[PDB]
Design an enzyme around this catalytic site. Structure first.
Site, PDB file in Angstrom:
ATOM      1  N   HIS A  27     -13.045  -3.932  -7.400  1.00 35.75           N
ATOM      2  CA  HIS A  27     -11.930  -4.045  -6.485  1.00 35.75           C
ATOM      3  C   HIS A  27     -11.435  -5.472  -6.511  1.00 35.75           C
ATOM      4  CE1 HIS A  27     -13.714  -0.320  -4.536  1.00 35.75           C
ATOM      5  NE2 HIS A  27     -12.484   0.012  -4.887  1.00 35.75           N
TER       6      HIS A  27
ATOM      7  N   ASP B 151       5.540  -1.534  -2.233  1.00 40.24           N
ATOM      8  CA  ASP B 151       4.552  -2.549  -2.484  1.00 40.24           C
ATOM      9  C   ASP B 151       3.680  -2.181  -3.649  1.00 40.24           C
ATOM     10  OD1 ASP B 151       3.212  -4.848  -2.246  1.00 40.24           O
ATOM     11  OD2 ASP B 151       1.922  -4.255  -0.553  1.00 40.24           O
TER      12      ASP B 151
ATOM     13  N   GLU C 161     -10.181  -7.165   2.053  1.00 40.72           N
ATOM     14  CA  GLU C 161      -9.685  -7.849   3.162  1.00 40.72           C
ATOM     15  C   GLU C 161      -8.352  -7.231   3.354  1.00 40.72           C
ATOM     16  OE1 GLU C 161     -11.630 -11.152   2.571  1.00 40.72           O
ATOM     17  OE2 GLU C 161     -12.305 -10.670   4.584  1.00 40.72           O
ATOM     18  N   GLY C 162      -8.091  -6.836   4.561  1.00 46.00           N
ATOM     19  CA  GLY C 162      -6.965  -6.024   4.857  1.00 46.00           C
ATOM     20  C   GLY C 162      -6.074  -6.786   5.759  1.00 46.00           C
TER      21      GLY C 162
HETATM   22  N1  LIG Z   1      -9.658   4.533  -0.200  1.00 46.19           N
HETATM   23  C1  LIG Z   1     -10.143   3.427  -0.799  1.00 46.19           C
HETATM   24  N2  LIG Z   1     -11.235   3.480  -1.600  1.00 46.19           N
HETATM   25  C2  LIG Z   1     -11.725   2.383  -2.202  1.00 46.19           C
HETATM   26  N3  LIG Z   1     -11.174   1.163  -2.066  1.00 46.19           N
HETATM   27  C3  LIG Z   1     -10.072   0.972  -1.300  1.00 46.19           C
HETATM   28  C4  LIG Z   1      -9.481   2.120  -0.599  1.00 46.19           C
HETATM   29  N4  LIG Z   1      -8.417   1.661   0.087  1.00 46.19           N
HETATM   30  C5  LIG Z   1      -8.330   0.328  -0.151  1.00 46.19           C
HETATM   31  N5  LIG Z   1      -9.319  -0.077  -0.969  1.00 46.19           N
HETATM   32  C6  LIG Z   1      -9.526  -1.463  -1.432  1.00 46.19           C
HETATM   33  O1  LIG Z   1      -9.179  -2.351  -0.368  1.00 46.19           O
HETATM   34  C7  LIG Z   1      -8.088  -3.190  -0.752  1.00 46.19           C
HETATM   35  C8  LIG Z   1      -7.122  -3.286   0.421  1.00 46.19           C
HETATM   36  O2  LIG Z   1      -6.644  -1.968   0.676  1.00 46.19           O
HETATM   37  P1  LIG Z   1      -5.040  -1.837   1.180  1.00 46.19           P
HETATM   38  O3  LIG Z   1      -4.677  -0.436   1.596  1.00 46.19           O
HETATM   39  O4  LIG Z   1      -4.418  -2.210  -0.172  1.00 46.19           O
HETATM   40  O5  LIG Z   1      -4.701  -2.849   2.348  1.00 46.19           O
HETATM   41  P2  LIG Z   1      -4.006  -4.273   2.305  1.00 46.19           P
HETATM   42  O6  LIG Z   1      -3.527  -4.686   0.944  1.00 46.19           O
HETATM   43  O7  LIG Z   1      -2.778  -4.124   3.241  1.00 46.19           O
HETATM   44  O8  LIG Z   1      -4.839  -5.446   2.879  1.00 46.19           O
HETATM   45  C9  LIG Z   1      -7.446  -2.534  -1.969  1.00 46.19           C
HETATM   46  O9  LIG Z   1      -6.978  -3.482  -2.932  1.00 46.19           O
HETATM   47  C10 LIG Z   1      -8.550  -1.695  -2.570  1.00 46.19           C
HETATM   48  O10 LIG Z   1      -9.192  -2.442  -3.606  1.00 46.19           O
HETATM   49 MG   LIG Z   2      -0.875  -4.126   2.305  1.00 46.10          MG
HETATM   50 MG   LIG Z   3      -2.760  -3.704  -0.763  1.00 43.12          MG
END
Ligand SMILES: Nc1ncnc2c1ncn2[C@@H]1O[C@H](COP(=O)(O)OP(=O)(O)O)[C@@H](O)[C@H]1O
Ligand SMILES: [Mg+2]
Ligand SMILES: [Mg+2]
Ligand SMILES: [Mg+2]
Length: 323
Positions: free
Chosen positions: A317, A136, A20-21
């Protein structure tokens, strides 16, 4: 392929939601032409007052300036079918550090830790050299693949930093548990040192498998930090009395540093590095470049290291760990 934004999302098979982003969901998916696994970060546009989110814009500008092994590399940007969201595309990473630690399926040897830290710090050093502060760093933002390759991720709060002369920056950065003392005490003209503190927290956490400072609130957090690293004071941190909240936020007794006692179970070279990373005065705190020259890391040859024992059948994850 220089020509971004035009390729369609339907060129990818969407396998499942892994995250979840902030501005949309994160998906695991597969490239229909290459068979390559990728992560897709959705950026939703519709119903945004200000359109394409300034947040994603900042992250995109930074991501495009970084190419390094240990740093997330965005492959392209793709679109929903037209005639509407965009999707940032990254190499798929099987896990992140938080999910693994939480899975309870993994144990990290000293050799695994060295390898992870070597890669994290080389990624961090590269960013710092490029004049970027990450701001972060935490477990959920460090990615690991089954080949045991690490990537620093989530540049959503990163910013450019003026190395030549000091400038004022946003103070409430870094999740609280990983947030260094100068920020809790209200510094706004901080340094790449803030990220190294985050990393020392990861390093300690790798040994204990639990986040080493866990408090609800800022004052409580400072007190926990004080309990382990010693009270902040001029004797070790002269400039501390210049910080806004130093008098207001004051620990509870004037603690001695007992970091080396509390983590005696750790190998001595790891412990040196930990000691230096968790040094209260950011000007005395080691740099990212310095960590790499430490006993613990200086002789780590990455090619010569076995991949760790990570599950190849479950993707660990952070979102998974909660569900
Ligand atoms: N390139 C990637 N490959 C696999 N999993 C990913 C990747 N990018 C992000 N994720 C998973 O998605 C989650 C959210 O990604 P992120 O860039 O941390 O955005 P946010 O924290 O702002 O919502 C991460 O904790 C990670 O587990
Ligand atoms: Mg973030
Ligand atoms: Mg993050
Ligand atoms: Mg050192």
């Amino acid at each position: 392929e220089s020509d971004w934004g035009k390729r369609c999302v339907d060129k990818f098979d969407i396998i499942g939601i892994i995250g979840e982003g902030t501005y949309g969901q994160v998906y695991k998916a597969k490239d229909k032409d290459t068979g390559e696994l990728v992560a897709l970060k959705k950026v939703r546009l519709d119903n945004e007052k200000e359109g394409f989110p300034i947040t994603a814009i900042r992250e995109i500008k930074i991501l495009r300036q970084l190419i390094h092994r240990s740093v997330v590399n965005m492959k392209e940007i793709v679109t929903d079918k037209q005639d509407g969201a965009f999707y940032l595309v990254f190499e798929y990473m099987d896990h992140d550090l938080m999910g693994l630690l939480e899975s309870g399926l993994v144990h990290f040897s000293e050799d695994h830790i060295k390898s992870f830290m070597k890669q994290l710090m080389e990624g961090l050093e590269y960013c710092h050299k490029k004049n970027f502060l990450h701001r972060d760093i935490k477990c959920s933002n460090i990615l690991l693949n089954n080949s045991g390759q690490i990537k620093l991720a989530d540049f959503g709060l990163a910013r450019l930093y003026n190395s030549e002369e000091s400038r004022p920056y946003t103070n409430k950065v870094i999740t609280l548990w990983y947030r260094p003392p100068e920020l809790l005490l209200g510094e706004e003209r901080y340094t790449p040192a803030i990220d190294v503190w985050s990393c020392g927290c990861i390093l300690g956490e790798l040994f204990t498998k639990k986040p080493i400072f866990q408090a609800n609130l800022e004052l409580a957090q400072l007190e926990l930090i004080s309990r382990l690293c010693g009270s902040p004071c001029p004797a070790v941190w002269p400039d501390v009395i210049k910080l806004p909240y130093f008098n207001t936020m004051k620990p509870k007794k004037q603690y001695r540093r007992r970091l080396r006692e509390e983590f005696s179970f750790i190998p001595s070279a790891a412990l040196d590095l930990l000691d230096h990373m968790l040094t209260l005065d950011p000007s005395k705190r080691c740099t990212a470049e310095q960590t790499l020259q430490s006993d613990f890391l200086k002789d780590v040859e990455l090619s010569k290291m076995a991949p760790p024992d990570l599950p190849h059948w479950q993707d660990c994850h952070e979102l998974w760990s909660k569900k």
